[PDB]
Design a protein around this nucleic acid. Structure first.
Length: 135
RNA sequence: AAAACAAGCUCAAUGAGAGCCAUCGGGGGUAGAUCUAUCUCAUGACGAGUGGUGGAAUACUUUGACUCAUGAGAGAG
């Protein structure tokens, strides 16, 4: 129970797919900023830690949200892609594009996909150092 | 005082210096704005993990972190 729909109207929301190595987030919310059901690979998504970020486990979490959305029930959610933060400069993982596609074939209506990765303008030092990571 | 020596001190170097003219450039200094990013703090939303890895653990978490939204501050770039 929620929308109190007018009759022949469409209700829209947001996705916020934060895709980063080690985890995936499908934290859907209203445009204003009131959070609806979220979920993620780590929580209800799986187990292990091995397979948090892997694109099956993102695909499982993105059905678990869209179970609820029809129920709430929204309709379609705008998708914004967040990769990772500024110092690292990392763009979204593979687990994004499986999470998006599970919402489509759930199925939930969509539109306006954006990359909202916080990139810096120069700014700060990375981890590691001069030589950086060497493994 | 009045003479004479054509009295005399070369050239204007793809040597050099100085001058003048219209440009050019992340040359240097001082002062103030600007742009995202990161961190902190305050408020709201949610409700079990988040992090991190070849794989894990130490670590922070319902005295509500992690993500999402607004607002203020800081120092560096």
């Amino acid at each position: 129970l929620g929308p109190v729909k007018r009759d022949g109207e469409i209700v829209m929301g947001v996705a916020h797919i934060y895709a980063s190595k080690n985890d995936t987030f499908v934290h859907v919310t209203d445009l204003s900023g009131s959070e609806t059901l979220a979920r993620c690979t780590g929580g209800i998504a799986v187990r292990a830690q091995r397979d948090e970020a892997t694109p099956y486990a993102a695909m499982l979490a993105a059905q678990a949200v869209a179970a609820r959305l029809k129920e709430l029930g929204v309709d379609g959610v705008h998708i914004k892609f967040r990769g990772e933060g500024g110092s690292s400069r990392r763009l979204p993982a593979q687990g994004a594009q499986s999470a998006l596609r599970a919402l489509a074939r759930a199925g939930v209506k969509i539109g306006r996909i954006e990359d909202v990765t916080p990139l810096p303008h120069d700014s700060t030092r990375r981890k590691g150092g001069r030589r950086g990571r060497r493994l």
